Amino acid sequence: MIDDDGYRPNVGIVICNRQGQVMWARRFGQHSWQFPQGGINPGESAEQAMYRALFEEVGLSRKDVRILASTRNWLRYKLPKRLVRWDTKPVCIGQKQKWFLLQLVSGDAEINMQTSSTPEFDGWRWVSYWYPVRQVVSFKRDVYRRVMKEFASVVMSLQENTPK
């Protein structure tokens, strides 16, 4: 499944841990960090696929989290040449992604990340807001910034309401 022009449809989970901090997790088998993103399953709508990725990536289900916001339209960006697949047909030249801001309702104790038998994450750490934007590769950084900007005040209001 590719969206018409060569874009893979995905959903990115922005877990926000209610201390004012964001999703970041060490990537299984790679031993370095990675962003979230999970493909959309054919004919599964964005919210349904978002709970699919929530399970595949974080090992959480349709109950462990609370949607607060989502990106106003599908963000997308273009893979660098060497990371373009050439094996997908159509050739996949980018990630079409809608990010969902999820407030954590369960947590670390209920997060399992190894639900999928070959997941992407091995374990994590809630980190300062803009930190993952610096950790990600330079071509993604700009786009991930937009995701963070779209949600910044939505997370910060919870750490900015008493004291706040």
Curated annotation (Swiss-Prot):
Motif (Nudix box): 38-59
Protein family: Belongs to the Nudix hydrolase family. RppH subfamily.
UniProt KW keywords: Hydrolase, Magnesium, Manganese, tRNA processing, Zinc
InterPro entries reported in the protein's UniProt record: Nudix_hydrolase, NUDIX_hydrolase-like_dom_sf, NUDIX_hydrolase_CS, NUDIX_hydrolase_dom, RppH
Quaternary state and interactors: Monomer. No interaction between this protein and catalytically inactive RNase PH was detected by immunoprecipitation.
Cofactor: Mg(2+); Zn(2+); Mn(2+)
Gene Ontology terms, MF aspect: hydrolase activity, acting on acid anhydrides, in phosphorus-containing anhydrides; magnesium ion binding; mRNA 5'-diphosphatase activity; RNA NAD-cap (NMN-forming) hydrolase activity
Gene Ontology, cellular component aspect: cytoplasm
Protein name, as recorded: RNA pyrophosphohydrolase
Phenotype when the gene is knocked out: Altered 5'-processing of primary pre-tRNA transcripts with short (<5 nucleotides) leaders; in the presence of the truncated inactive allele encoded by rph in strains derived from K12 W1485, including strains MG1655 and W3110. In the presence of wild-type (catalytically active) RNase PH no effect on processing. No effect on growth rate, a slightly stronger effect is seen when combined with the inactive rph allele.
Free-text remark on how the cofactor is bound: Magnesium or zinc. Manganese can be used to a lesser extent.
Annotated source species: Escherichia coli (strain K12)
Functional pH dependence: Optimum pH is 8.5-9.0.
Presence of the UniProt keyword Zinc in the record: yes
Function: Master regulator of 5'-end-dependent mRNA decay. Accelerates the degradation of transcripts by removing pyrophosphate from the 5'-end of triphosphorylated RNA, leading to a more labile monophosphorylated state that can stimulate subsequent ribonuclease cleavage. Preferentially hydrolyzes diadenosine penta-phosphate with ATP as one of the reaction products. Also able to hydrolyze diadenosine hexa- and tetra-phosphate. Has no activity on diadenosine tri-phosphate, ADP-ribose, NADH and UDP-glucose.
Chain's gene name: rppH
Annotated HAMAP family: Nudix_RppH (MF_00298)
The EC number(s) this enzyme carries: 3.6.1.-
